[PDB]
Design an enzyme around this catalytic site. Structure first.
Site, mmCIF file in Angstrom:
data_model
loop_
_atom_site.group_PDB
_atom_site.id
_atom_site.type_symbol
_atom_site.label_atom_id
_atom_site.label_comp_id
_atom_site.label_asym_id
_atom_site.label_seq_id
_atom_site.Cartn_x
_atom_site.Cartn_y
_atom_site.Cartn_z
ATOM 1 N N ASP B 93 0.978 -1.281 -0.231
ATOM 2 C CA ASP B 93 -0.257 0.212 -0.159
ATOM 3 C C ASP B 93 0.697 1.585 0.416
ATOM 4 O O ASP B 93 0.877 2.522 -0.143
ATOM 5 C CB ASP B 93 -0.969 -0.224 0.745
ATOM 6 C CG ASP B 93 -1.893 -0.872 0.735
ATOM 7 O OD1 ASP B 93 -2.544 -0.861 -0.551
ATOM 8 O OD2 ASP B 93 -2.934 -1.292 2.405
ATOM 9 N N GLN B 156 13.194 -16.519 -1.182
ATOM 10 C CA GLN B 156 14.866 -16.589 -0.372
ATOM 11 C C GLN B 156 14.509 -18.049 -0.559
ATOM 12 O O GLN B 156 14.134 -18.771 0.313
ATOM 13 C CB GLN B 156 15.097 -15.475 0.501
ATOM 14 C CG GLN B 156 15.990 -13.807 0.309
ATOM 15 C CD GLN B 156 16.436 -12.996 1.267
ATOM 16 O OE1 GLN B 156 16.239 -12.677 1.809
ATOM 17 N NE2 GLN B 156 17.905 -13.838 1.470
ATOM 18 N N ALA B 183 24.889 -16.640 3.260
ATOM 19 C CA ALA B 183 25.264 -17.142 4.675
ATOM 20 C C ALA B 183 24.723 -17.199 5.258
ATOM 21 O O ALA B 183 24.740 -18.770 6.212
ATOM 22 C CB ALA B 183 25.787 -15.366 5.304
ATOM 23 N N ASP B 184 22.885 -17.472 5.510
ATOM 24 C CA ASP B 184 21.878 -18.208 5.740
ATOM 25 C C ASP B 184 21.817 -20.094 5.409
ATOM 26 O O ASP B 184 21.897 -20.905 6.230
ATOM 27 C CB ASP B 184 20.710 -17.965 6.116
ATOM 28 C CG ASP B 184 20.059 -16.733 6.305
ATOM 29 O OD1 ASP B 184 20.202 -16.855 7.472
ATOM 30 O OD2 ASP B 184 19.086 -15.535 6.174
HETATM 31 MG MG LIG Z 1 19.735 -14.330 4.395
#
Ligand SMILES: [Mg+2]
Ligand SMILES: [Mg+2]
Ligand SMILES: [Mg+2]
Ligand SMILES: [Mg+2]
Ligand SMILES: [Mg+2]
Ligand SMILES: [Mg+2]
Lengths: 260, 260, 260, 260, 260, 260
Positions: B93, B156, B183-184
């Site tokens: 919005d 992701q 990284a994750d």
């Molecule tokens: Mg991440």
């Protein structure tokens, strides 16, 4: 520890380093953010200039940048928008101890800058220490009696007139440093803000030499490293070597271009 | 000129470029400032990621960053703190058209992300277009009918579970791109957020190839330039090549060090 | 000095003091102001609670309060609005190391609170340390490897259900302290948020003793000084003894009344 | 496109329209919000007046309203709180190119207003373009050499003294327009801020005629449409025809009353 | 006078008016500004809706809008982003007494909304009244005992599922009013947020009648005046008849157009 | 009720109480927060001083503190940073009716302070009432004709010069009160900001007597209750008896120390 913190807060480390002739390497802060200020407070500079003249800062954003910077070794310096006693009073009460005063044209103006920072009888600083972060709301003992000696006044000479009046400015008690602004100076000299001309460079280097000779600290902002080293060699003691907005803009631009 | 401004506000240029297989070079924005966002919008990036997951942003700061970036060629992408339909609604919005949704683990979650962005019957997006910057307070003609098609959803994949579910995630209609968070991912694979290990690089490379072969856009953030070029070589279409906080921190550090 | 600043930023002094059985005296911060936070950081408290549950705080105001408090000896503790892994992630990235988690009802919920604070494999904390104040934008060396051990998780027991589950909650690894909320507890027990009833005091006393015997730290907020000393006598290790809004409201009221 | 954006940003379209004698229809902005500014930027006005004299604006809120307005065809004009060279300097550095200067009493004051906007030798504008949104942090090429010509100075005549000095004010180079403030004028003339009196109207219309005769642009703010058309007929070139606070207040009031 | 101020702060005038069958005329607030909120509080509306679902508001901006509106006769109603007990808790502690809860689909959800607003044993509202503006930091006597009865819960029915569940929703104790969202409803019914279709109008009319016959208050937002009067005629008791952003946008557009 | 609210808003209750010789007990506000201002507005003081001289306030924070304070019986007084007609104009337009003007040295300065608050012909107040909260955006009927009489000007005498010029200052029409600042006065007298010396006390008490004798209101700020009662006995009519920052700091400090 609180006691240790307070009896430690009063001392102006930047002023002490200038008196001892320790050169101080600085970064200009125009990003006007307490967040990026903290980030840059960890970069390893001796001083950080919070710009209230050419960046959209005011008393309130200065306050939050001082808070952000506080736990770091980097020392804050604040530039008011002009040599204004009211604005100087407000900046001092939120905790500013080192001031960079733009457009100081003569010894009278330099004296006015000094007196704005000092309590009577030595100046006209208004008293409101209970209200003020400067005294930590009256937790710094004997604040009223200790404050004047920890103020550090740096005046900018930025015109041909200021350069002519330099000997008299250097005679003013309480002026601890004299800062040459090359962009404003070259503009006044007819070189439209570009300091990379032999006449501007000569006036700059001669001034640095005269400043240091008087026993006061010369200062300057210069993005060219080779010129910075050259001003340092001549005796400059507070040298700002870059500007946060410029560092960010140029690093991002160069990165984008590497990828076409 | 107002008619002309509105009939071009609607169009998602980032989504159009991804569909055409034009690689897009990005910069991550963690400074959480509308001021530095505008500065960085002038640097030449195809896209800028306003990070609401790992930077102190909210709907309000996203809004002012979108306003700052608006007149520049660089296209804004927004990362919500999670795959949350309420937050997604609020981000849309205020004018967000391209979302990077963190921690999407499977096709059901990808589908939920897509549906959060679309008006009924194609989704569950709540209707409040008179109130919203998205429709420019109803000045964009036929907004309700044109909105869905200009939404661009990027998901992701950040875990081994997500990598296993990649074929099914890629079968979800409305998933325009799949972004790998190295990284994750490396953290989940047992390498503690440090992606420079053969096993992590192999999984990344395989995923990029797999994404691109399914006709979708592969995405990644990578600070190492040579890795970035390799991923581009392999078919990645939205590649963020640096982070504003890092650019700033590293340039300031190197500058300070050059002066000791 | 920067190396020295960073190699000491990492250390959780509050967690260390709790482990050593040093009682910590706290003040609750509901004023939601970085300005009054700094003022109160100078008053001599061991810890300050930045309340994101019952005061108008968010991640953004938590950040500026952390910055304000940073140079003082007083240690910050942050209360999220609930046991929400997303909000916990965001609070940790702005630099929160000590969390007071409201309404923890059982061991599963306590375990979820602990895991939200820890990087894989010990938890589910999302990785974005280049962007975060927590790592000082990567200037803290080996942040990803040192972070988990410096996290301090305190869980609130606020209901009869929670009191029944106390033995199991206390068996959860990573739960460093257990905080009793007397107002929520008395409300749940049928005393409408008024804790000064024998049955509520007995449950509080028994819980403090039980917590301390399991080797964990008992915590409580109590405005009545004599009750505070009693709980300290019994083994409580983190005791908030007042609330900034209340201190201010009561001192102003009494002052006004003395003048009619 | 970045190149196109920058070589396009410099040009003052409002100034160009006034020189060409194209009448410009304006709206006053006193809501002091970057949000409503963007909303109103899409309404179809040629110009929008950001009021720093009678609305609670400052340099920082001006900056965010300029950012909001930027992508729209409507052109921003900014009123400083007074003819203050320091405040003018700060407004120019955040990107103001068109200034409406209140209470200009004589030709000296008009000249001071003009010189505050221009770099030496043509004025006293302080140089800090690396720091400034005005130059887009030095991305606008040759900014220092191009800036003076794109500044547009509009002076307000608001008293009987100013009206008497009008011929001399119209002789001042760099004064591009002269704006009559009817509320301040009628107040000075003894009609307590109400311009709807024959003597005030006569002084207004005579002034508009004299202004246009000199080749400069007459301007005025008038909420009465019939009077606005009448000033336009006489040659006024920048006419503000309403005020955002008034439009909102009157529309809401009339709506509430329709429902009793 | 302080005693007198507090013993009248507690009372919910909007809830009292709804119970007495007094129709209440409302304006929707999407401008997200404490400044325009005060301006609009003077326009004569019975109630003002601070929109946290479709406008960029949060708990913090709700608070400042409540403060702005406080001295005026117009009564504030707040819409949370969703039926979220945590957000509801936070809204209540800043002083919200009347909630408009979006997307309530069934009686269980309506019951959850009611319980979020009430202290135990009648609900699950968390206790922190010393910290809260709701109790004026404990200056309202017996706040904990008087709070529940002054809470006013309004639930939005926005889907065909919700319309089917209307009889059961209406049987929920504590549901004071039922609000129909015509845009969300028409979207769910297959009319794309455009309510001006016979089938949508019929469902709206039937629901208004059904709500009112059960002794509860019907509510609606409608920009068309003749539809508004019809719904009033049929028994609607809380009717918002316009939206601030729309009032402003349309008045500015029409004004600009009158001048070409 | 709106009508009642507006015809009620205009009246300056503080001014009326001073004219009637009703002593007014005050609290200084330096916390610069609309949140704590509201909290303190309920404490029972007759007046609250919003300090724009020694606290980090500006026109915008004054505005939000006035809004916060508005529904309470406590009456706002505002101190500008100096006797600045532009700043006074801006403070009046956001709704300030009572001004405390620092550093008034002589009758000319006192007259300038008075004229800054009044519309022509009685002063130089600039007219912009449509834009202004002062007139409630033109909802207060006959605002322009009623405003001058409701302005209350209080001047500070803070130096030996001001004390010498007191008889002439007391002759200035429109000066309603004269406030002695003991900290600034003792500093000027050579006692370094500490008023607890017999010579300072004598000058203070003599002044209070002279002020009251002229029929004007004496005022002072004094944290010592015994001295406050003594100034009240001598006829002081506006006495501030504490400072919010001091009340908070001292209550928190004393609390921490009670727990060691
Ligand atoms: Mg991440
Ligand atoms: Mg300069
Ligand atoms: Mg609790
Ligand atoms: Mg005027
Ligand atoms: Mg709806
Ligand atoms: Mg004083």
């Amino acid at each position: 520890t609180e006691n240790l913190y307070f009896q430690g807060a009063m001392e102006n480390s930047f002023k002490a380093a200038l008196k001892a002739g320790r050169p101080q390497i600085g970064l200009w802060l125009g990003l006007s953010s307490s967040y990026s200020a903290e980030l840059l407070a960890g970069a390893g500079f001796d001083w950080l200039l919070i710009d209230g003249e050419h960046a959209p800062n005011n008393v309130q954003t200065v306050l939050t940048q001082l808070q952000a910077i506080a736990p770091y070794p980097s020392q804050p310096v604040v530039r008011p928008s002009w040599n204004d006693p009211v604005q100087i009073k407000q900046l001092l009460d939120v905790g500013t101890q080192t001031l960079l005063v733009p457009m100081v044209q003569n010894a009278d103006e330099a004296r006015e800058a000094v007196r704005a920072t000092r309590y009577p009888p030595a100046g006209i600083r208004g008293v409101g220490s209970a209200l003020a972060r400067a005294s930590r709301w009256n937790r710094i003992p004997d604040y009223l009696q200790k404050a004047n000696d920890q103020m550090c006044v740096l005046v900018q000479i930025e015109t041909r007139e200021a350069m002519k009046n330099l000997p008299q400015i250097l005679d003013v008690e309480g002026v601890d440093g004299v800062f040459i602004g090359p962009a404003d100076l070259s503009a006044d000299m007819g070189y439209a803000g570009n300091p990379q001309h032999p006449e501007v460079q000569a006036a700059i280097e001669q001034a640095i030499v005269q400043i240091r000779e008087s026993g006061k600290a010369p200062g300057i902002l210069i993005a060219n490293e080779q010129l910075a080293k050259r001003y340092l060699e001549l005796g400059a003691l507070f040298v700002a070597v870059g500007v946060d907005t410029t560092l960010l803009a140029r690093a991002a631009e160069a990165l984008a271009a590497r990828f076409g």
